[PDB]
């Protein structure tokens, strides 16, 4: 997303995705392996219709 100035992204699933970033945050993204601390984000998906 940061590469494209419009912060738009494309995916093989047919979903256009827009990424907005807030960077003041200690948020944890948890999984079976490790807890990744990163800046929060939001992902919108456009209407491919």
Which stretches of the chain bind another protein, using CB under 8 A?
2-3, 32-39
* Nearest CB to another protein, comparing residues 15 and 41: 41
Residue 3 CB, shortest distance to another protein, in Å, is 5
* Nearest CB to another protein, comparing residues 40 and 46: 40
| Contacts by residues 39-45 (CB-CB < 8 Å, ≥ 24 positions apart) | 43/17, 43/18, 43/19, 44/17, 44/18, 44/20, 45/15, 45/16, 45/17, 45/18
Residue 24 CB, shortest distance to another protein, in Å, is 12
């Amino acid at each position: 997303s940061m590469a494209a100035k419009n912060r738009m992204v494309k995916t093989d699933y047919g979903l256009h995705v827009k990424v907005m970033l807030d960077y003041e945050k200690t948020i944890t993204l948890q999984a079976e392996d490790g807890n990744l601390l990163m800046p929060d984000a939001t992902f919108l998906f456009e209407e491919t219709r």
